[PDB]
Amino acid sequence: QYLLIDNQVSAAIKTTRIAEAIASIQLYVNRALENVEENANSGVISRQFFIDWDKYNKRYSTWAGVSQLVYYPENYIDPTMRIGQTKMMDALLQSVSQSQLNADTVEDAFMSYLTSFEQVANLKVISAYHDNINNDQGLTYFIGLSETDAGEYYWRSVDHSKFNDGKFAANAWSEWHKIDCPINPYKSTIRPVIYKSRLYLLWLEQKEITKTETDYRYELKLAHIRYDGTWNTPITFDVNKKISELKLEKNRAPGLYCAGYQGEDTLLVMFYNQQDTLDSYKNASMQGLYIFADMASKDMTPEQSNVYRDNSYQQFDTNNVRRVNNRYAEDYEIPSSVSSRKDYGWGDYYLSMVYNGDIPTINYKAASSDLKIYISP
């Protein structure tokens, strides 16, 4: 173990000088990484090379594999299946899986694929949301719709950090994904939002009611995606009153403001009587509510309403302009506490350590040009 060479091995067993040197080092490395041999250089161990020791670096053959991949990816590319292929491709492959594959089978399989292709190619974008404070950072989610009565909604997103030199990299975009929720947005009134780092859909629905006379009831539906990619069911909020407050024309939909908010760890929803001029919203009374992760809700008071309005109105749709919401925020978004350390280390002679301290509270003031941070560690 110390000399990294076997002095017990039979004379009959042969090797090469290069192979020996390699084997010797691999043993050396394992022992240091495994903490068999103490006082190892932890700085060095933390290097990516050793991070990969268990895959690709420990064994030459896998090393060569990953290394070669760079120059000759084609020795590894198999068109039968690619990483990140979409479901349409999966269907295509499956459709040609039988051994009795011929031109008739092939042409039909192709058209199946193509049908699905068209369905995607023609999706109409209805609305979108950027999960950040500023549009220059983070990513935008888009929701669209298949062209069919009783159609289906889909979503995808784009990464703004990839918008290099004015343009998005191909990598910036994700594929459209199916939504399995029974969505019936009233006059398209739907927004994709992020709350608690999860995608939620909110939409307003109108029910036709016989009163004789005809009138309508309005309901807010909320749904969210599950960890396995399936969706939960819609949750209904009685917003009929909040909607009745907006003096909308009979054929108009209220505008829907919706975005998450880190402060108060909540979801902020407001409805409004859409104007032609964005600035007219500065004097509008927003009809809103708070939504919580437990699907609890609270009415939003006029004071709260005016505040969120003043800080968000610039995102509102106007009669002829469809806008994208951002995460609600005020001058500065600052975390309320810190539990996750960024670094640490041992004291002299490793007889002590400063460790697992924290910042249980972060308070702040933010006057114009005077940001005051209060840390109580």
Partner: protein, 145 residues
């Protein structure tokens, strides 16, 4: 010797043939089939959520005026019923995935046995060729005598 060499070739063919099958564990198509069985079972949660949403929606009355209501009072039970029935079909789907997979496992095990059978035959044959070569030498010595 010629007869034995032809036998050897036969055993060699069998050996390599079972070798190939052993090594080519699962045909890519076979993997797709198992993938599909899993994928279908995976719909269980999606299904349940939709049926539930359905039942709730139908508890809401839809007739209004000087007469009304019409809510489906049995909607919950019906949806509940469908989910259980679906689950039964899923259990078969999952069991089918499993059965197919284990079937392949057993198949591969048999190939290994036959591979080894061919190997043993080859070794015996080589040993027979060796004994024959000795016999040949003896015949040469007999000629010499």
């Amino acid at each position: 010797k010629t007869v034995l060499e032809k036998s050897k070739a036969g055993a060699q063919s069998r050996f390599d043939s079972y070798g190939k099958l052993y090594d080519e564990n699962i045909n890519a198509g076979e993997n797709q089939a198992m993938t599909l069985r899993a994928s279908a079972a995976g719909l269980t949660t999606a299904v349940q959520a939709s049926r539930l949403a359905g039942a709730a929606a139908d508890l809401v009355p839809n007739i209004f005026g000087f007469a009304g209501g019409g809510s489906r009072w049995g909607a919950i039970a019906e949806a509940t019923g469908y989910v259980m029935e679906f689950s039964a079909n899923v259990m078969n789907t999952e069991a089918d995935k499993i059965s197919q997979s284990e079937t392949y496992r057993r198949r591969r095990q048999e190939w290994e046995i036959q591979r080894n059978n061919a190997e043993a035959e080859l070794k015996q044959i080589d040993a027979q060729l060796k004994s024959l070569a000795v016999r040949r030498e003896a015949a040469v010595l007999q000629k010499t005598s």
